[PDB]
Amino acid sequence: HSSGLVPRGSHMANVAIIGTEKSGRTSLAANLGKKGTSSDITMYNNDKEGRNMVFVDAHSYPKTLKSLITALNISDIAVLCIPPQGLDAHTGECIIALDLLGFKHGIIALTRSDSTHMHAIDELKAKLKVITSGTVLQDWECISLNTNKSAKNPFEGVDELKARINEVAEKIEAENAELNSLPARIFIDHAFNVTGKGCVVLGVVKQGISKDKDKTKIFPLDRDIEIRSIQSHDVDIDSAPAGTRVGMRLKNVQAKDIERGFIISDKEIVTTDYTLECTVSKFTKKIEPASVLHLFVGLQSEPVRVEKILVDGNEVEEAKPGSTCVLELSGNKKLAYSKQDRFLLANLDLTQRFAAYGFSK
């Protein structure tokens, strides 16, 4: 039994459209759905074509990492846009980020196809088979396409991209369904006041099934809240299973006290310090005590200091690129997380800024 006249269906996909400067990312996202919420990321909704699809354009990357990492941690499928001759520093940084995230499901869009030739595209596909070997991208399809209605081959490859997104989406729907039996968690990416509605948050159910009228909590505030209604693609629903992009009206909390990164759930860890078992990228600088990193967990991102580095429980003066270590980290702000949440560490002053992933010890 469910609300309304026709069940939602577990038909949905949340897709991140990412990549380097001048890669056709925004034009692709903009031609795949209707412009919705827009901050440092922009949602393009499309519930007109079978799935409730949300495409998130990380338009503030490469300027900021938060734009990219937010788009990624609310999405289940990544479309990495690489333009002709587009093997540059940011395409490399995106590949490294996806691989440090263990991001399973994606597609390479070889954009701007009308600006290039088959034989060049075949050479770039060959190249990418190399760069992505032994990474999570290794078996991602590369689809050549453009979004130029005036080209000789207008919108070639867009139908093929969409068909591959739907194939991957079907696999993710089964994976997310397995998570329905877990306790609900919802990650919030936006919060605002709505006249006559009060506190509304937008987010995605990460696991479990969130139900209308649930009495639960919000973290890191650690405050009791009630879910007054859940909306998906403009329609109120009684329940929202894992994977569902939601808008929720909340009782007992004010939008001004919520930030992107807050979590609705019955229990989360809240700390300002972290002890992480980390795997350091081969493509970063050795990590040293008392140095500065940026930490991302869920949809949160804050500066941290490395207090202590251990290898085999013994304290060391460095963690080399491409090594494993424990990092004791300290920070100012209280963050919420559970142990399943992958942490990413960055050095914002580098060229390739991603340093490591880790999990709470």
User: Which CATH number goes with the domain that contains 311?
Assistant: 2.40.30.10
Distances from the Cα of 330 to the Cα of 18, 71, 274, 325, 337, angstroms: 30, 26, 6, 16, 15
- 287/156 same-domain check: no
- 142/17 same-domain check: yes
Q: Is residue 3 part of a domain?
A: no
CA angle 192, 302, 262 (to 5 degrees): 35
- 163/61 same-domain check: yes
Binding-site entries: 23-27, 114, 147
- 92/120 same-domain check: yes
Binding-site entries for GDP: 23-27, 114, 147
As given in the structure block, the two tokens for residue 80 are: 């990495």
Method: X-ray
**What is the distance between the alpha carbons of residues 119 and 123, in angstroms, rounded to a whole number?**
6
- 136/243 same-domain check: no
Q: Is residue 330 part of a domain?
A: yes
- 243/319 same-domain check: no
Residue recorded with tokens 């998906």: 232
**What is the distance between the alpha carbons of residues 263 and 203, in angstroms, rounded to a whole number?**
9
Q: Is residue 2 part of a domain?
A: no
Q: Is residue 71 part of a domain?
A: yes
Exposed / middle / buried, residue 203 (Cβ in 10 Å: 0-12, 13-18, 19+):
buried
Helices (H), the chain: 25-30, 65-74, 89-101, 118-131, 158-178
User: What range defines the domain where residue 297 resides?
Assistant: 268-361
**What is the distance between the alpha carbons of residues 191 and 299, in angstroms, rounded to a whole number?**
13
- Provide CB contacts within 8 A for 196, sequence distance 6+: none
- 50/120 same-domain check: yes
**What is the distance between the alpha carbons of residues 96 and 106, in angstroms, rounded to a whole number?**
14
- Domains in the chain: how many in total? 3
**What is the distance between the alpha carbons of residues 30 and 40, in angstroms, rounded to a whole number?**
15
Q: For residue 102, what is the domain's CATH number?
A: 3.40.50.300
- Provide CB contacts within 8 A for 43, sequence distance 6+: 33, 35, 36, 37, 54, 55, 56, 57
- 238/335 same-domain check: no
**What is the distance between the alpha carbons of residues 123 and 108, in angstroms, rounded to a whole number?**
14
Following DSSP, what letter does each residue of 284-308 receive, concatenated?
A: SPPB-TT-EEEEEETTEEEEEEEEE
End residue of a domain, out of 182, 214, 245: 182
Q: Is residue 5 part of a domain?
A: no
Count Cα atoms within 13 angstroms, Cβ side, for 89: 8
Q: Is residue 1 part of a domain?
A: no
- 176/188 same-domain check: no
Q: Is residue 4 part of a domain?
A: no
The beta-strand segments (E) located in 102-222 are 106-110, 141-144, 185-194, 198-207, 209-211, 215-219
End residue of a domain, out of 218, 239, 267: 267
Q: Residues 135, 80: contact at Cβ < 8 Å?
A: no
Q: Residues 308, 328: contact at Cβ < 8 Å?
A: yes
As given in the structure block, the two tokens for residue 305 are: 């200091």
End residue of a domain, out of 210, 234, 267: 267
- 177/209 same-domain check: no
Query: Resolution in angstroms, to 1 decimal, for this deposition?
Result: 1.5
- Provide CB contacts within 8 A for 25, sequence distance 6+: 17, 18, 19, 57, 58, 59, 81, 111
Burial 315-338 (b: 16+ CB within 10 A, else e): ebeebeeebebbbbbebeeebbbb
As given in the structure block, the two tokens for residue 176 are: 């997310």
- 316/343 same-domain check: yes
Q: Is residue 297 part of a domain?
A: yes
- 60/166 same-domain check: yes
Q: How many CB atoms lie within 10 A of CB 243?
A: 23
C-alpha of 59 from chain center: 13
- Provide CB contacts within 8 A for 291, sequence distance 6+: 305, 306
